[PDB]
Amino acid sequence: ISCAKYEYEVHANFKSCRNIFQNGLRFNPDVPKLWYEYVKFELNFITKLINRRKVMGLINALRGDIALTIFDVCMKTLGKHYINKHKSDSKMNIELNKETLNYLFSESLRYIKLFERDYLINHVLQFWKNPELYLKTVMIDITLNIR
Amino acid sequence: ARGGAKVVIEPHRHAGVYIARGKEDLLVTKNMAPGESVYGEKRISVEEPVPPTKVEYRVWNPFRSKLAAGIMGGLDELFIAPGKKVLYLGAASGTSVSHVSDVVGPEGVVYAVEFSHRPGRELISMAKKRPNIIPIIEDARHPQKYRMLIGMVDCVFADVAQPDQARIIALNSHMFLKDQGGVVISIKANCIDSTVDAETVFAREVQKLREERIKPLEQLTLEPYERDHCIVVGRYMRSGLK
Amino acid sequence: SADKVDVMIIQAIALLDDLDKELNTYAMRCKEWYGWHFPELAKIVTDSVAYARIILTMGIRSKASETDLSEILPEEIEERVKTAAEVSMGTEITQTDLDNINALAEQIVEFAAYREQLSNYLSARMKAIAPNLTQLVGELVGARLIAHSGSLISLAKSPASTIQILGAEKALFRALKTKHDTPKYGLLYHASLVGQATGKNKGKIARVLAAKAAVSLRYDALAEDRDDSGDIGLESRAKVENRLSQLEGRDLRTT
Amino acid sequence: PIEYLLFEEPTGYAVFKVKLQQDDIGSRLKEVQEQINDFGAFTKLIELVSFAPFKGAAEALENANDISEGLVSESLKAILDLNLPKASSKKKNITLAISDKNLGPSIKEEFPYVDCISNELAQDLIRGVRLHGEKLFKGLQSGDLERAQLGLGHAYSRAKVKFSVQKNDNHIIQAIALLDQLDKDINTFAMRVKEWYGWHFPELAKLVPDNYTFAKLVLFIKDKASLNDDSLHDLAALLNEDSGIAQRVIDNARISMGQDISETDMENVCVFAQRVASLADYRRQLYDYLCEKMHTVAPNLSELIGEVIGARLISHAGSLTNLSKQAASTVQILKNKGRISRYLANKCSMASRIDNYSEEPSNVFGSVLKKQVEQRLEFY
Amino acid sequence: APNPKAFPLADAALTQQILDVVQQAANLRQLKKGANEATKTLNRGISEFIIMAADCEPIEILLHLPLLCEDKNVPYVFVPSRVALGRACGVSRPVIAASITTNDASAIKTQIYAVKDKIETLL
RNA sequence: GCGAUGAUCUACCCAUGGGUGGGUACAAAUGGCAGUCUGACAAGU
């Protein structure tokens, strides 16, 4: 994170920061903190590009899609890794499956708290659906319509 | 001998092993996991003084082992000791690898290697009860195949029956054995070569060792226990065999 | 009075000894099962009650690496168990087996709590029956002396040197018939004053404490208007404490 | 020209960089072998440049199995792709050193500018690395290599032998041992509470012999006095009033000469009786679990003889493995009565054979053998 | 996917050679007949090689033998009929397992060593 | 309508009852071994 942050904050070479993040995720595809930071960097890069477009046009959903594909592969590899860390029988495997799903979707709630905000939460809950967590999700739906 | 007799334990010349003197003398190793005989042998028990405990010793049968046969015939040097690391090639089961593990004790380790899987299951159960052993259920001619499990073992023992005995010993001992490290081979003449005689087989295999840079120190034949068998003790030199 | 039941004392101390023995053997068997699954916990934590509470806390190496065990173990031993659970050599269990192991650990915890409850009950019983001997030598040693001698009356009838010797009868009679030197402590070794003395002072304090214990015993077994506040025992402890402190202040070497 | 070498450890991979190429013609010399041994010279020969540990025990198992097969795992690909400089693939390929000639070609097919050497000089460097071990890492690698060896070895060997969960029988052995000790201690503690309350009520102590019912009776009856007709019907809801035992004990309680005890004594007696009752409940639970595990692990033997006796045979032979290893007369070692017991020994040995060496056994052949022994009994 | 539990099983020519040495050994009193006698010879150490039937009902009752064979380094074969094994063994009843024991002053020594060489290369 | 998936063999009285007798694992015994040390000095100045 620190080398990527120095590179993007002082010299601002977004391609270099991208390659740094991809290498770091190749080494540690287990760390939700590093996944979180990659998503945050991509979001900041998108907002900077948007504001540069705004000031350019002022003088004279692809982005959400890439952040959300990063979220999708985040959920895939985090599920795989929380399973493989402590790989048994029917009840044991089923209980472990419930615990893994609980952990993954608590992390996605943290992604929501990190959070076209409406479109972002919309596609997150779309991937989610595709008990109490279901209630919290439909609560998120109602509060999104409030927002 | 019987179910109630009383004996006097005594330290042998080699450390780790003991003699049980009575009306007939019994080779003995200190039992590590006490209360369960592995291959059904009788076992001695002393009581030692906190409240005292019951320590247990285990008899070593030389009509079953091919290392207690060497001990009883009298080997001047055996490189297995109370604190070392021993690589055991051809470890069929506890019937010898458990006694070797009781000799090296809780400080040292023993890596047992077997190919076939039913003795593998026996080895897995016995190694679960005994922590000094790590088991490998893989072919012993492929140290590259199991290189991630072994680091710089200190002696090698060989109970391999296959006729490539000297080459498989040379491979494992170049890979893992330490310098100036003890090699102990149990040669079976009938398995190595059936047509020619046992002495010819023995001279031939000591020649193969000396070619593969193991300097043989001694050679015993262990005659009242097995026929046509031999134990060669050598030292792995790697630097100036002369 | 309804509370003066030395039969309840001797039954309680016999139950205490058997309870300790059986709790020990059941703890060993529980260590055997959960060492068949977890072969490092036995060499990490030898406290059998801690073993049972750890088994009640987690039932698998992942729950060992996730849940918190602060009230059971210190933090360094806790993280050491966590790394051992990360790399454990033993197999994994099925659910009915984990049920039975959990029930066995609950049995161990219940027996430990029952032993503590019974020990406190016996202590209050001694403070109700022979409070002066309780103030002198302690509840455990008082119950052991009463249990050895049978009844409080027989223990009061015995002289003081017998109350000193009372435990070491094997070595006593062997030395007597062999013409050797007789043992000097007896059962009074585990009283606190003999636990504070050092060597020849342990011998002399065993003698003085035995004399004062015989005084207290003859008071309590034969009192008609017993105060049940133990002032005789308090003053005997005062005299023994003063004697011991003076005998420790007395020095052997040169200055 | 052996520029980089790769060493694989149970806690992850490491890549060293060669500082000096030792000379190649004098490699069988005493001076060069002793420079391998001395740590004063291996520091001049090899420096560590990278080290990446494994993430978990399962990935260590999978990566060790993959090194054993000789293919390139993902973590290996990651470390090599980080460390190796992309030189040209025609002129001056980089040179890696590898312990395995078989591992070589997969490295080449992955990275096309790397040449993998496994000669005696590379074996010499790798032997020096393995010898000096933990000292080379300058302090990095946490976790102890010995514990890592033992865990990874047991896990890899179990995976290669394809171990099971059913054929485990130490649960059976320890369950029958615990059944024996529970029965002995429940009898002891039940006699203890029986005496310790028959001191207060010897008529009841003489009347009701059964220990669990006696414990329930002491749990109900606090004193021998506060026992009315509703409590009489409460004992009728308990054991039996049609036998009249409730009437007998209420008459003996109304006429009792037992010495009255203190309230703390009665409370502690109640606590002890509660403890004994819970122990009896645990014993019944253990019995039923033992019957279930015998029907799962040894159904043929348990069909032929019984759950508890089958557990006795297993625990006395030592394991089901040894019981099926043994002959058909030593299991008897473990007139018509003697001959029929010998026949039963033969047949229980055969049932032990099939029950162990099948993978999931079958009560059909259990029942076949049982029906055969029963037909032989009818023949006698 | 795996091997059958009976494996290694013998070709018909090797089966004929095996049963020939079985009958001559039973004629000259070198053959122990039955799974118990075979296991006893494996413990006592007197056996030379083992023949086992690969169709008895069921296969596990004699499948206890290869574990002892592997731990004591004895070769073993699986012939496909206990009926033919009992016939060539000279019993009035099918045998499922036989043990050719060792002897040194035996008339059939090179016959036993020939078939045992064939078995050791079969494994 | 047999058998290698195993045939055969491994103390005294009263014409398949009771009465003598010996031997191995576990319990109870206020049954036995089995008898509760010495007795005027000691320490300081």
Coordinates of N, CA and C in Angstrom, one line a residue, chain A residues 8 14 18 42-56 63:
Chain A
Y8 N 1.4 7.0 -6.6 CA 0.2 7.7 -7.1 C 0.0 9.1 -6.5
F14 N -0.6 6.4 -12.6 CA -1.6 5.5 -12.3 C -1.4 4.1 -12.9
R18 N -1.3 0.7 -10.8 CA -2.1 -0.4 -11.2 C -1.3 -1.7 -11.2
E42 N -9.0 2.8 -7.1 CA -9.7 2.8 -8.4 C -10.8 3.9 -8.4
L43 N -11.5 4.0 -7.2 CA -12.6 5.0 -7.1 C -12.0 6.4 -7.2
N44 N -10.9 6.6 -6.5 CA -10.3 7.9 -6.5 C -9.8 8.3 -7.8
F45 N -9.2 7.3 -8.6 CA -8.7 7.6 -9.9 C -9.9 8.0 -10.8
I46 N -11.0 7.3 -10.6 CA -12.2 7.6 -11.5 C -12.7 9.0 -11.2
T47 N -12.8 9.4 -9.9 CA -13.3 10.7 -9.6 C -12.4 11.8 -10.1
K48 N -11.0 11.5 -10.0 CA -10.1 12.5 -10.6 C -10.3 12.6 -12.1
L49 N -10.4 11.5 -12.8 CA -10.7 11.6 -14.2 C -12.0 12.3 -14.6
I50 N -13.0 12.1 -13.8 CA -14.3 12.7 -14.0 C -14.2 14.2 -13.8
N51 N -13.5 14.6 -12.7 CA -13.4 16.1 -12.5 C -12.4 16.7 -13.5
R52 N -11.5 16.0 -14.0 CA -10.6 16.5 -15.1 C -11.5 16.7 -16.4
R53 N -12.3 15.7 -16.7 CA -13.3 15.9 -17.8 C -14.2 17.1 -17.6
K54 N -14.6 17.3 -16.3 CA -15.5 18.4 -16.0 C -14.8 19.8 -16.2
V55 N -13.6 19.9 -15.8 CA -12.9 21.2 -16.0 C -12.4 21.4 -17.4
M56 N -12.2 20.3 -18.1 CA -11.9 20.4 -19.6 C -13.1 21.0 -20.3
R63 N -16.7 2.7 -15.4 CA -15.9 2.9 -14.2 C -16.4 2.2 -13.0

